[PDB]
Design an enzyme around this catalytic site. Structure first.
Site, mmCIF file in Angstrom:
data_model
loop_
_atom_site.group_PDB
_atom_site.id
_atom_site.type_symbol
_atom_site.label_atom_id
_atom_site.label_comp_id
_atom_site.label_asym_id
_atom_site.label_seq_id
_atom_site.Cartn_x
_atom_site.Cartn_y
_atom_site.Cartn_z
ATOM 1 N N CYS A 214 29.788 40.316 22.844
ATOM 2 C CA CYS A 214 31.197 40.034 23.093
ATOM 3 C C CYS A 214 31.535 40.183 24.570
ATOM 4 C CB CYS A 214 32.084 40.949 22.239
ATOM 5 S SG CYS A 214 31.613 42.691 22.181
ATOM 6 N N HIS B 208 35.256 46.743 21.129
ATOM 7 C CA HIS B 208 35.201 45.289 20.997
ATOM 8 C C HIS B 208 35.964 44.637 22.138
ATOM 9 C CE1 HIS B 208 34.693 41.445 19.110
ATOM 10 N NE2 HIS B 208 35.960 41.303 18.766
ATOM 11 N N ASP C 27 38.241 34.911 19.541
ATOM 12 C CA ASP C 27 37.265 35.979 19.350
ATOM 13 C C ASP C 27 35.870 35.411 19.090
ATOM 14 O OD1 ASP C 27 35.690 38.171 18.410
ATOM 15 O OD2 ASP C 27 37.580 39.156 17.772
#
EC number: 3.4.22.-
Length: 148
Positions: A62, A97, A114
């Site tokens: 991420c 995250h 995302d």
């Protein structure tokens, strides 16, 4: 006609070359959803050109995905902000995250974009990779430590 996202940018072009054509953040999300993979490696990063090479083969995390795709979406003309959050998944655990906040054109302001939803947990655009719980932590990637 009405203005549309620019496909001219440097990092956009190298992503088009690797995953197929897209015309906006939504189609981008769908081509990513179709071509790319999630690979976890702690907090480590790679250069964007490395992420472009790995993202469909061995995969990226991420942090790298936010680094590259925020550049792509700003070239396209979107308002972008990488957000640092913690998500609670259906297993009961919280996870640190990074996701993107994107607005403009066809996206409403503050829309969630995302990478991990797209490639790993299969949640649609606008929805973070886990939904059991959310906490904003801050804006941006945490930097490296300095000491001695």
């Amino acid at each position: 006609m009405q203005p549309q996202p620019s496909l001219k940018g440097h990092w956009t072009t190298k992503v088009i070359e690797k995953i197929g054509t897209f015309h906006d953040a939504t189609s981008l999300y769908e081509r990513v959803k179709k071509t790319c993979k999630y690979k976890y490696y702690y907090n480590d990063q790679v250069p964007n050109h490395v992420a472009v090479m790995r993202m469909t083969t061995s995969g990226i995390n991420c942090t790298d995905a936010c680094q590259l795709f925020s550049k792509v979406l700003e070239e396209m003309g979107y308002e972008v902000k990488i957000e640092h959050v913690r998500v609670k998944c259906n297993d009961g655990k919280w996870y640190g995250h990074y996701l993107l906040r994107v607005g403009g054109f066809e996206l409403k302001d503050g829309t969630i974009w995302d990478y991990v939803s797209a490639t790993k947990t299969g949640r649609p655009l606008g929805v973070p990779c886990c939904t059991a719980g959310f906490q904003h932590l801050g804006w941006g990637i945490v930097g490296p430590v300095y000491d001695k």
